[PDB]
mmCIF file of C-alpha atoms and ligand atoms in Angstrom:
data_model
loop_
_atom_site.group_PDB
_atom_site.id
_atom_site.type_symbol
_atom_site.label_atom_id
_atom_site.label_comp_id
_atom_site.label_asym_id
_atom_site.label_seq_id
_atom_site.Cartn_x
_atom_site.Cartn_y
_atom_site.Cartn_z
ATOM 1 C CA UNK N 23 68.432 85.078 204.353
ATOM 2 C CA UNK N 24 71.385 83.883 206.347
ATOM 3 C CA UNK N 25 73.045 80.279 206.569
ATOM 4 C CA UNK N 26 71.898 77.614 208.426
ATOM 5 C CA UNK N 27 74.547 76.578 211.435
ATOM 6 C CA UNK N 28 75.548 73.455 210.112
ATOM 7 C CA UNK N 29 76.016 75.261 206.933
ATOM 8 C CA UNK N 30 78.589 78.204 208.126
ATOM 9 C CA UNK N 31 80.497 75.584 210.731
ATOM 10 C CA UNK N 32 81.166 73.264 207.491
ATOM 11 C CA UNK N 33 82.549 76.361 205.574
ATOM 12 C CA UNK N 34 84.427 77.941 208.516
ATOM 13 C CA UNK N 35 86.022 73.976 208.509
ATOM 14 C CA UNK N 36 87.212 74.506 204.960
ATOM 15 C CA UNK N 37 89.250 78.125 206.227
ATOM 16 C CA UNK N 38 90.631 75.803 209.109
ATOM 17 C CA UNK N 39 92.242 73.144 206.626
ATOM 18 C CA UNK N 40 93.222 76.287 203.974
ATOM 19 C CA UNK N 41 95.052 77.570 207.236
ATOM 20 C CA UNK N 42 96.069 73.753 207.437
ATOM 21 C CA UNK N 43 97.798 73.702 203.896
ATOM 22 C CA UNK N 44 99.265 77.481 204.226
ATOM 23 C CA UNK N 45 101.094 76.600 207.297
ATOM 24 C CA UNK N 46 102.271 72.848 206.069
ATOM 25 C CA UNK N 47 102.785 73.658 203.119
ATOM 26 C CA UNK N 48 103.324 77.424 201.834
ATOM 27 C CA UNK N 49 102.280 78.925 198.617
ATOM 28 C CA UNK N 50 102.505 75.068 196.898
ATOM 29 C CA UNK N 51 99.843 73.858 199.965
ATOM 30 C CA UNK N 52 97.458 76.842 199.291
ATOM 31 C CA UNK N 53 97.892 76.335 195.702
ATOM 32 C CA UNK N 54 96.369 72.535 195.987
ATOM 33 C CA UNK N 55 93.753 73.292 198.352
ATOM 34 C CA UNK N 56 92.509 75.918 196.182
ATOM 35 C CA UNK N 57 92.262 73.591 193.081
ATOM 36 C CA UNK N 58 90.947 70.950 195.429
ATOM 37 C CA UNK N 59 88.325 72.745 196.641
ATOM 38 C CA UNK N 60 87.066 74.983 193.907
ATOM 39 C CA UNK N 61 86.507 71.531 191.887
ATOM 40 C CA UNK N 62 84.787 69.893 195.037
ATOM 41 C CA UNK N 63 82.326 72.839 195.417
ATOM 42 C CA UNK N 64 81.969 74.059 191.724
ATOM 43 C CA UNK N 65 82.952 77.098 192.872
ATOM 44 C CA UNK N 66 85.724 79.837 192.649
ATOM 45 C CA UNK N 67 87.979 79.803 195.866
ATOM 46 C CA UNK N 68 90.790 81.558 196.888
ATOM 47 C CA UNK N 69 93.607 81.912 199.601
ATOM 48 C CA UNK N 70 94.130 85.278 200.239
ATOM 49 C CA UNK N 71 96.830 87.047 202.657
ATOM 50 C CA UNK N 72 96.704 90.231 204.519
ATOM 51 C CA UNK N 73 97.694 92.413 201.511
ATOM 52 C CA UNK N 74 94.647 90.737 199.972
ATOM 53 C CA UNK N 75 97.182 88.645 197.835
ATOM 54 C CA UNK N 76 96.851 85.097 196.383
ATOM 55 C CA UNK N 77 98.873 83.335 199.474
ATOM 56 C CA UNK N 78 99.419 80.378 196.353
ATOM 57 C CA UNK N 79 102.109 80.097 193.673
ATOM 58 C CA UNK N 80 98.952 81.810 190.873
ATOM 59 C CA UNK N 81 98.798 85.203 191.540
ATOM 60 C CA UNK N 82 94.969 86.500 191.347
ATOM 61 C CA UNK N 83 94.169 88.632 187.844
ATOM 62 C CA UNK N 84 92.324 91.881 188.423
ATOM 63 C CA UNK N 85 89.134 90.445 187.840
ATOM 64 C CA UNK N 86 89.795 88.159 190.507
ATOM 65 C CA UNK N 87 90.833 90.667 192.831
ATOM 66 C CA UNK N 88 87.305 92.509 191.874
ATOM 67 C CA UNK N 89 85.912 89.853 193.980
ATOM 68 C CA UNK N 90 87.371 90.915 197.408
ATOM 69 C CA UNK N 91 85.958 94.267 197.877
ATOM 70 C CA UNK N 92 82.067 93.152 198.602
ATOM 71 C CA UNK N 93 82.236 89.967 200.622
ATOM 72 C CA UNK N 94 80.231 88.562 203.281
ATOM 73 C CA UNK N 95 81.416 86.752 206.835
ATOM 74 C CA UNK N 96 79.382 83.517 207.436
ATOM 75 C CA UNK N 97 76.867 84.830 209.947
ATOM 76 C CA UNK N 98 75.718 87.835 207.684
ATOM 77 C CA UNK N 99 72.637 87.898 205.365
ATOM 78 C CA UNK N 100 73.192 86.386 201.878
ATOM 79 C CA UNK N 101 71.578 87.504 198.630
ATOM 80 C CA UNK N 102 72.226 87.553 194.791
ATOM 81 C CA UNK N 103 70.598 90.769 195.069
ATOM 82 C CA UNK N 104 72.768 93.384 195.292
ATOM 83 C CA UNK N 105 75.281 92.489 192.544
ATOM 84 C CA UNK N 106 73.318 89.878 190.733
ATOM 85 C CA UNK N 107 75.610 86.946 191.396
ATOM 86 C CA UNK N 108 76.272 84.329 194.227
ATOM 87 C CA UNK N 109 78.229 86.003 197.011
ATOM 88 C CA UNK N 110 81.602 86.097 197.858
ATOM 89 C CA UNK N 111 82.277 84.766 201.748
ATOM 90 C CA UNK N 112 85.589 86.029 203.370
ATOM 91 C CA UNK N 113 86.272 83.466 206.386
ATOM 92 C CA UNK N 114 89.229 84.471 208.348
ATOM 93 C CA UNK N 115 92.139 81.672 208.833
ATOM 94 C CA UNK N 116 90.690 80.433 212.627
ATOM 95 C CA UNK N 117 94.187 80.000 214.350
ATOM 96 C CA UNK N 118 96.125 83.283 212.861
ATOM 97 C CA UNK N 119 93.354 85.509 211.135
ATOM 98 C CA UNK N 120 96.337 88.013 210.586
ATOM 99 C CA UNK N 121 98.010 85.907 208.158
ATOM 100 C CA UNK N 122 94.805 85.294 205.401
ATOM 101 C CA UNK N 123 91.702 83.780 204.954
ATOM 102 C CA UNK N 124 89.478 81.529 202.510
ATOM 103 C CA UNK N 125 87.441 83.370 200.237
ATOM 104 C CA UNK N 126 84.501 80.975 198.103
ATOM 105 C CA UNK N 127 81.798 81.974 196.120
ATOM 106 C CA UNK N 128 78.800 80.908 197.917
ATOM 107 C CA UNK N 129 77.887 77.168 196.474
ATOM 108 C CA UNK N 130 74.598 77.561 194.479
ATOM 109 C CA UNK N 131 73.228 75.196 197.043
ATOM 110 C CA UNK N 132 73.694 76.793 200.156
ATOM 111 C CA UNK N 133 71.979 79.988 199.209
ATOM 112 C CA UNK N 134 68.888 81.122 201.913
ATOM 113 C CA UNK A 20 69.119 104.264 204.555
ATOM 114 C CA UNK A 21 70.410 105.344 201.098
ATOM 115 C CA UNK A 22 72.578 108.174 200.586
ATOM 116 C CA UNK A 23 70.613 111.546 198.986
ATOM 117 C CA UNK A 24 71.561 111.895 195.402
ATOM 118 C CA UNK A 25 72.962 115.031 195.564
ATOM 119 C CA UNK A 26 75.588 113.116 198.092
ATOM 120 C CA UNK A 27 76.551 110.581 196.266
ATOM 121 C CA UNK A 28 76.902 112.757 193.424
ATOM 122 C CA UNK A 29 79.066 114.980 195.249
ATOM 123 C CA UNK A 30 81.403 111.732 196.121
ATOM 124 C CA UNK A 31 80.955 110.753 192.593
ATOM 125 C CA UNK A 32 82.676 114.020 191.961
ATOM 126 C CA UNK A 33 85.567 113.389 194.505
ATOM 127 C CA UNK A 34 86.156 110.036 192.573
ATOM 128 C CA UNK A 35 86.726 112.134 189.050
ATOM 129 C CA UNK A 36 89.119 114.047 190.983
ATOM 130 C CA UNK A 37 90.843 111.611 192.346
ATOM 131 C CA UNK A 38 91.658 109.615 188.825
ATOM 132 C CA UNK A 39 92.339 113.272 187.343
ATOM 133 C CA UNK A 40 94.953 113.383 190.090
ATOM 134 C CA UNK A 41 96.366 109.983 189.190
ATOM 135 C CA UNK A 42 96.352 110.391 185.141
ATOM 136 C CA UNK A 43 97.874 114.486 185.746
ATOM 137 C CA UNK A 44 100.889 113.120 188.031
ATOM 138 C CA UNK A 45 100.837 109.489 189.018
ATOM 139 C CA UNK A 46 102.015 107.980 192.768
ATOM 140 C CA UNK A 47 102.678 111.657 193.639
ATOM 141 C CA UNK A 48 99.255 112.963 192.568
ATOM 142 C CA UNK A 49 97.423 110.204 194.191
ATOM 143 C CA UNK A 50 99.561 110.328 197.367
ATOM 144 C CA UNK A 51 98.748 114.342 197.683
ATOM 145 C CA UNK A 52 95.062 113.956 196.582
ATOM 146 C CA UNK A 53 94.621 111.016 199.394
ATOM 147 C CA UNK A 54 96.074 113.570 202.049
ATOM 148 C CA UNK A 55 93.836 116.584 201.074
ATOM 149 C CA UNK A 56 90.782 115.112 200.934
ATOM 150 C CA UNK A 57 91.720 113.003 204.067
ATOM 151 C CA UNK A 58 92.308 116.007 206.014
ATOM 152 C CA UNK A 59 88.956 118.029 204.245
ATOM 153 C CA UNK A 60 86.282 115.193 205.057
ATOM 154 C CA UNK A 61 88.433 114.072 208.160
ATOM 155 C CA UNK A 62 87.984 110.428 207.053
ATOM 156 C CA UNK A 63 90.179 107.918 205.775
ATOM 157 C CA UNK A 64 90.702 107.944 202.297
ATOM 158 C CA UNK A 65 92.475 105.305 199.437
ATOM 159 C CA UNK A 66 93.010 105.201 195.859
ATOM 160 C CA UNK A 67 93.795 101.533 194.736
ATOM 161 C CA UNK A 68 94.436 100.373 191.963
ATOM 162 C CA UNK A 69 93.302 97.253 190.026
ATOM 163 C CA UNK A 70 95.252 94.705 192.190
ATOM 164 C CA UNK A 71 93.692 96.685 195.329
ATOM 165 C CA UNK A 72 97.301 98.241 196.173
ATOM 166 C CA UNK A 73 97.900 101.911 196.733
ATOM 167 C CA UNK A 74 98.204 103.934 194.045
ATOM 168 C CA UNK A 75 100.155 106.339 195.723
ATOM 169 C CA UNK A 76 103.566 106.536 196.916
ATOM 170 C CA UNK A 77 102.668 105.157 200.434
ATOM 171 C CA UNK A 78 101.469 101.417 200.574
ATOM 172 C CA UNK A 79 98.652 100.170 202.646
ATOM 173 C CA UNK A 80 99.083 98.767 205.892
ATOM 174 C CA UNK A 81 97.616 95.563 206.475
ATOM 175 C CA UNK A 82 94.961 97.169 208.759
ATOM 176 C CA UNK A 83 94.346 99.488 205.980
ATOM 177 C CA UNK A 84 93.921 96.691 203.359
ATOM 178 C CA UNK A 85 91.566 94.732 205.887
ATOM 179 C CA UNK A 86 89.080 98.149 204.951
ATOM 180 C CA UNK A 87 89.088 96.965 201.849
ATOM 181 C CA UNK A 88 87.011 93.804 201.969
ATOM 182 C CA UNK A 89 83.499 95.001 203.149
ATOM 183 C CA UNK A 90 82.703 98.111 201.115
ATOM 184 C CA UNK A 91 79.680 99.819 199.625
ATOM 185 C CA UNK A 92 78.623 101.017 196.430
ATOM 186 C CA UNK A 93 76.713 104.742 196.186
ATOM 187 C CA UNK A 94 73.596 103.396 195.713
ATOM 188 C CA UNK A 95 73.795 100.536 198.037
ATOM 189 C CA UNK A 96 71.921 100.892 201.362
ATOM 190 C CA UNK A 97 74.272 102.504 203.871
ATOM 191 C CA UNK A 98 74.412 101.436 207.901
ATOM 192 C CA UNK A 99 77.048 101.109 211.017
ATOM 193 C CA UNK A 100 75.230 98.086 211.811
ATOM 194 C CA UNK A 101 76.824 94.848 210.836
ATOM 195 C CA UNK A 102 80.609 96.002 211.635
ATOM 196 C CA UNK A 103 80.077 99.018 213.941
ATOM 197 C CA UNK A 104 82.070 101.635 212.325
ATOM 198 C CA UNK A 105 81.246 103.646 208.968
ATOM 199 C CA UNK A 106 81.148 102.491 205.992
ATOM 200 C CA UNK A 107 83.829 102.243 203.608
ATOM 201 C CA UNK A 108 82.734 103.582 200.241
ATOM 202 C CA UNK A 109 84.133 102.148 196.786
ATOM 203 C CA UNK A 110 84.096 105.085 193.572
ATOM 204 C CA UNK A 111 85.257 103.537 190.472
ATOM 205 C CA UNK A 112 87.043 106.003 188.170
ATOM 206 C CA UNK A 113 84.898 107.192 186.367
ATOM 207 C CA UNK A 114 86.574 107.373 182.996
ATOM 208 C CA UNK A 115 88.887 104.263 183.328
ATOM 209 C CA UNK A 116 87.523 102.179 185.976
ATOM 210 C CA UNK A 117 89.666 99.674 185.531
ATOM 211 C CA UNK A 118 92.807 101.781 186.434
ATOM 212 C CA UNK A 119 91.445 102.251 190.064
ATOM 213 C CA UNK A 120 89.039 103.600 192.305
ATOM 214 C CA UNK A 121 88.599 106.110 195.189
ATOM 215 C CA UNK A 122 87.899 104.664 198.728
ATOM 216 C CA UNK A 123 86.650 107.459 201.544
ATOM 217 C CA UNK A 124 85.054 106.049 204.512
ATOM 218 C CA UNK A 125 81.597 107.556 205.074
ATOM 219 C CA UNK A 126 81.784 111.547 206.297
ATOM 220 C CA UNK A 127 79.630 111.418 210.105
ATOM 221 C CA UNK A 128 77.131 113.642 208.499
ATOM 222 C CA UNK A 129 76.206 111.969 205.113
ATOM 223 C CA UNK A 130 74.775 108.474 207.162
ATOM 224 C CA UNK A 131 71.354 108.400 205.909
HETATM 225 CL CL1 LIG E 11 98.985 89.147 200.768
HETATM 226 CL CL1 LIG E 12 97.926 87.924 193.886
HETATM 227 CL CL1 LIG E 13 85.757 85.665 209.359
HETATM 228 CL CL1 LIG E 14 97.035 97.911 192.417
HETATM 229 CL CL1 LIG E 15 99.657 99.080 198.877
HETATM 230 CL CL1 LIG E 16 81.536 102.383 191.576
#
């Protein structure tokens, strides 16, 4: 029911570079890595700041904002359970948690 | 672990009230509904809307929109566990859910 290691250091990597972009580059930088990584993973991402807004240039629709109220951190248990659909993993931005984090919908993959 | 059914009927209730409150009078109603419940249950207490903002006159800190992220549904299992603190409960409204929903960290004396 919960992540392997490997598995939560290799998504808390992906809230390091999302920090990475954000700080680089702004909204335009967390706008990329978003589409970057949501068509790596097959999976809906977002960059989020501490008003729980889209930190990119595409501001989140309600339904996507739906999303943020039931998440999971990395080391928690994971389940489809609950809501019947893969979970939603808030990982705090490592160097300034304060200013946002990466939120992905678990990868159908990784699931325990 | 799960909240009695009379209980979360009774918060069910508090959630009608709320969106009564917001449809009779707005930022104003919601601000004045937040405060007297607040200060009944002596808990922290939200209505937000569909973009997770305030629907009352006074916006949510940062701190407050951090509560945001890790709620629980009525019916969900309910435990100070895996953050330490009580949980923070999520009420749609009932008639319009997607105009907003009441948030009321768990009362002390309703933890199963
Ligand atoms: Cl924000
Ligand atoms: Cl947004
Ligand atoms: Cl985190
Ligand atoms: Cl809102
Ligand atoms: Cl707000
Ligand atoms: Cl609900």
């Amino acid at each position: 029911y919960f992540l392997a290691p490997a598995d939560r250091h290799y998504l808390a990597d992906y809230a390091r570079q999302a920090e990475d972009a954000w700080r680089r580059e702004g909204a335009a930088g967390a706008e990329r890595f978003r589409k970057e990584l949501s068509a790596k993973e097959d999976t809906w991402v977002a960059l989020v700041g501490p008003h729980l807004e889209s930190l990119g240039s595409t501001p989140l629709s309600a339904e996507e904002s739906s999303h943020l109220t039931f998440m999971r951190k990395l080391d928690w248990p994971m389940s489809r359970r609950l809501q019947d659909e893969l979970p939603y993993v808030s990982i705090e931005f490592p160097g300034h948690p304060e200013q946002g984090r990466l939120v992905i919908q678990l990868p159908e993959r990784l699931l325990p």
